[PDB]
Design a protein around this ligand. Structure first.
Ligand SMILES: N[C@@]1(O)CC=C([N+](=O)[O-])C=C1C(=O)O
Ligand SMILES: N[C@@]1(O)CC=C([N+](=O)[O-])C=C1C(=O)O
Ligand SMILES: [Zn+2]
Lengths: 421, 212, 212
């Protein structure tokens, strides 16, 4: 019926799918400069008559929300992906292989679309943009609205210390902001690269700044030696011992807080993402303090404070004096009332892909996704899309997969959006 | 809520008489819609009143702004006119339910309009409030000298920053000295304030010595 | 026209139910006033319709804009709300008479409002137009090939810059091809434009060769 017409339409849109993904993917859009990517999506939605609005905290970092309006009386469904990408051309503090073409460009070759910015997340975004286009142009009958939500600042960047405001913000100005300012729907599908495996639980997080204290500092010609590490007046040396203790804690933490939900299994992990002590341009006197910055994932049922106290206990056991300061906390959610979306998706999937959906791996259920803000706001939300995971990490999409995903999205909407809310 | 009408005409060409709901002037149509929405608002607060342990929520509705056309060009009436509604929600009401009710009001008048949400925040009843509630009650009973009284509905049916604390899993309640500037109070007895500061300090001396 | 009401309340405190004309929300009161003024406007153009040698004036009324409160602060309804009225005047109507009529509508509803004029311009029937009228009529009959008809009422019930000329003792009429934009027309026939150009040229060759 309507389904067959839309599948046909999508078959004939492969070139638009390719072009949209490559054009989007080619736009430099590291978290902090997603503006240009947002502009492209705004103009794309405007050309295709989705009546887009820029919904943003800043005029050059915004979410784009468009709409395919239904005829009335049906459940509405959001499709969502993010505009920001991982690699800034400056990120040589993190990666030894900075500015390799794969991290900054996107291109079609041999039925593949290459580019990390395609995998995460312009590719899945193109998929539902095309799906929405096909739905509209085939004149698919939909009682409920389809909400088209492209968000800035999904990636886990956060302000801290002297790094504040516009340049360093992300999730607070992204999806939750978009939803809170009008992008609401009955359900929400977050399009990310999941290899056609649906997840509807994700982790929360608490970031801790741990600062070890020591001192007194001494001009190098006066440094006392030999001194036991833990007693070293150099905070950097004390921190070195703490790092090992924290790695041991981290090893067990993920086991102890592993938790299996209906929506997937959460294995919450810990990493030390940054360290700094003293400043490189003044090193003649060692520092009396040294700070690490810890990324600690939380299963949906763990209070951030429990984790803070555990880290404080590691410090105390070493006999060290440290400040354990949270500078970020977000909750994770298992979707509730996800069934109508889960089922419409399962049906669409089985039809398009040909077999039942496989269960997602732990990592894809144990990270940040924008399903959290949706679920937080009472909008049952799962994550689903084509391609091996970016954090995998994959480097291209098969155009065939992208088309399957687009078809799955379209069918999901034609099912769910014609149910009564 | 943006009502559509039109087509706009230079004043010397405006068609009259025309029934209000059919007026080409969106402002005239909107005047009718405002009536119906006020009627709806009157019932809405009844139908969605709801009792919670932490208070009785009476969610109210008000039309906080209207605009159509611009004051500095008035020679052709506007084809659209917009009002902006503040609709409170009890913690258990989905904003889409409300949007759909407002849309129904519009449809029943036979009007064409866009009902566009531009803000949504959830309200919460605190969970696991007991330790704070008790530490507070004890300090309060001492200092004020009687059991705490349940709060009026407005104070339970507004926005407070307890919402984000509760949202984030930090059990939270609101409490302090004074009449509600909502409301319309305009002064504080220094004595009441000193009572509040004592209640706060006692509440802390108790609660912060509870083991987590 | 600014209707006053109040006192404003934070939405969770708004008093309901309250009859429209009694609403503390000025927007709600103004909605009822809009209906009354639409009625007044329906009859106004009839009452002040007036025939002149130069055309029949049908002075119309429209509400060109409305604003009350501001859309970025809507949690407390506004104590005042304003509309902006375009009221055409035939050349023999004093603006104060009209202001009084509108004030009368307001008081009959029992509302408090400021009715404030912020623009007044006079309309004119040309005097001593005959030489131009004639020069035009001759050229028109010759180029267009038929006597002129009287203009439709909207086209001599509007603002045109004949007013300033006539005001300043320069007898002036308006004439050209095509339907009125305010109507409104969308195109000109190049053929009509040519006729108009010829009518203009012929009018000048006649009139500019008569003695002052
Ligand atoms: N929650 C508010 O702060 C927000 C708005 C008003 N107000 O309308 O004046 C009063 C409040 C209050 O009760 O303190
Ligand atoms: N006098 C005007 O120029 C000004 C305003 C309009 N209009 O609002 O369409 C029309 C006129 C006209 O066509 O004569
Ligand atoms: Zn992503």
């Amino acid at each position: 019926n309507d389904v067959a017409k839309v599948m046909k339409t999508l078959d004939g849109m492969r070139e638009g799918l390719i072009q949209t993904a490559v054009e989007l993917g080619s736009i430099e859009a590291p978290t902090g400069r997603e503006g240009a990517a947002g502009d492209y999506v705004y103009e794309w939605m405007a050309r295709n008559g989705f009546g887009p609005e820029r919904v943003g905290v800043f005029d050059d970092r915004f979410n784009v929300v468009g709409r395919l309006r239904g005829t009335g009386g049906g459940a509405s469904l959001s499709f969502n992906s993010h505009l920001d990408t991982i690699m800034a051309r400056e990120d040589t503090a993190r990666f030894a292989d900075a500015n390799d073409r794969i991290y900054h460009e996107a291109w079609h070759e041999e039925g593949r679309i290459y580019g990390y910015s395609v995998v995460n997340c312009k590719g899945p975004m193109a998929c539902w943009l095309i799906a929405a286009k096909a739905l509209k142009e085939a004149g698919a009958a939909l009682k409920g609205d389809v909400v088209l939500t492209a968000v800035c600042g999904e990636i886990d960047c956060e302000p801290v210390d002297e790094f504040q405001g516009h340049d360093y913000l992300a999730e607070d100005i992204g999806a939750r902001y978009a939803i809170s300012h009008g992008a609401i729907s009955d359900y929400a599908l977050v399009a990310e690269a999941t290899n056609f495996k649906p997840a509807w639980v994700e982790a929360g997080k608490v970031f801790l700044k741990v600062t070890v204290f020591a001192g007194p500092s001494r001009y190098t010609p006066y440094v006392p030696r030999p001194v036991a590490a833990l007693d070293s007046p150099n905070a950097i040396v004390r921190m070195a011992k703490l790092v090992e203790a924290l790695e041991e804690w981290a090893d067990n933490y993920e086991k102890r807080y592993t938790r299996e939900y209906g929506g997937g299994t959460v294995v919450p992990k810990v990493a030390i993402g940054a360290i700094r002590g003293g400043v490189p341009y003044k090193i003649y006197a060692f520092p009396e303090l040294c700070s690490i910055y810890m990324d600690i994932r939380l299963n949906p049922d763990t209070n951030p404070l429990v984790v803070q106290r555990e880290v404080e206990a590691v410090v105390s056991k070493l006999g060290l004096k440290a400040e354990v300061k949270p500078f970020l906390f977000r909750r994770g959610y298992e979707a509730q009332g996800i069934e109508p979306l889960q089922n419409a998706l399962e049906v669409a999937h089985r039809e398009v892909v040909g077999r039942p959906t496989e269960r997602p791996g732990s990592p894809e259920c144990s990270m940040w996704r924008d399903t959290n803000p949706y679920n937080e706001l009472g909008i049952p939300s799962l994550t689903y899309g084509c391609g091996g995971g970016a954090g995998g990490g994959n480097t291209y999409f098969l155009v065939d997969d992208m088309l399957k995903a687009a078809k799955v999205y379209a069918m999901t909407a034609m099912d769910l959006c014609n149910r009564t809310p």
